Amino acid sequence: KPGRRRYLTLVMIFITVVICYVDRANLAVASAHIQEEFGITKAEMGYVFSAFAWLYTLCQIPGGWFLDRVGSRVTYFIAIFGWSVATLFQGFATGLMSLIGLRAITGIFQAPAFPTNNRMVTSWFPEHERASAVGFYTSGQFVGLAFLTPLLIWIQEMLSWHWVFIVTGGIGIIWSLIWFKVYQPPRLTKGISKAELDYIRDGGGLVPLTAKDWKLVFHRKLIGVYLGQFAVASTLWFFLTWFPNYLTQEKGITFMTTVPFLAAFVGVLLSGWVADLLVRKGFSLGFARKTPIICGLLISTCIMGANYTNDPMMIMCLMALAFFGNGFASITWSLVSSLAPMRLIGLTGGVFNFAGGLGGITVPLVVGYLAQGYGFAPALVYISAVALIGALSYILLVGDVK
């Protein structure tokens, strides 16, 4: 009865966020064959992984500027059709230099995925259901990064390894042109409902660099929010890049690739829904999403307790609970669109994950730096410290709705 096509764009985004995260972990799937063919060393492989991580964060502040400058639609086509071509060409790469360069190119076009979807969902879902929308396409990340990894392995072992980059890259190419022709602003869309467009707008859904603005974006209210995701997105990047299973593996654990990614799946899902229901009630817009972020980041510190047993106990349960707190508090960016000024929606989205994605580059490096000289115990307290620092820095500098 009410507007129904508004969620169509949400599904297309969910599809995009899935495809975007498949091209993130497709390299890890083939990482057991890429080293052997080119004769690459373990250290050199790190360049291939790092190539995507670095440019992904560095190419957000240009993307944030590129998003507002060029628009919200064409940017995603250039993005989807951008990285999808790089990934496709990676299947025909000759030498690690071709892989490092292409993975760099892949990170460039895939960087403006976070700010572009945010404005896209904010121009279509700036209401109470933005958290349910934010908690919807984020689940596709945990699903798209994992639930498709077995299918890649199936295509990897039976057929050649190149098809993993042709499938993931080829699907993205088709999806860009598909998405390019179907999605468009609400008024300019073919079928617009008289009630939906007003329904979308009643919540706030609408279609050079200044020195002053340059210093204002780095404000206390946004700074405390920037630091918040530095502790949220980081925990997800261990699983993406550096450390699924590396050193000291006999007395680390013993199935591990699906447990935390479900707890976060429903974690982001219900958390986006809990904040969604709370906000429509007599609670503030920030407090409805702030609350599940604080306790979540507090739940994220639950992993510190896994070392008290050192015995084949139910660590996996509290492991999923600790990862549930990150997912439950994974809608930390659902409010960045609100606090950010109307003029600079793209830049804030970049500088935002520029702290979160950076967390995916520095936090994994810290956990590794102490595991050789010390062990895993200082790594669990650090993740809890970053989560506590994330929570602590949030509750103090949250500053509600600026």
Ligand SMILES: O=C(O)[C@H](O)[C@@H](O)[C@@H](O)[C@H](O)CO
């Ligand atoms: O790519 C992205 O959207 C960001 O990394 C981040 O928003 C996601 O990883 C998730 O929402 C939080 O970890």
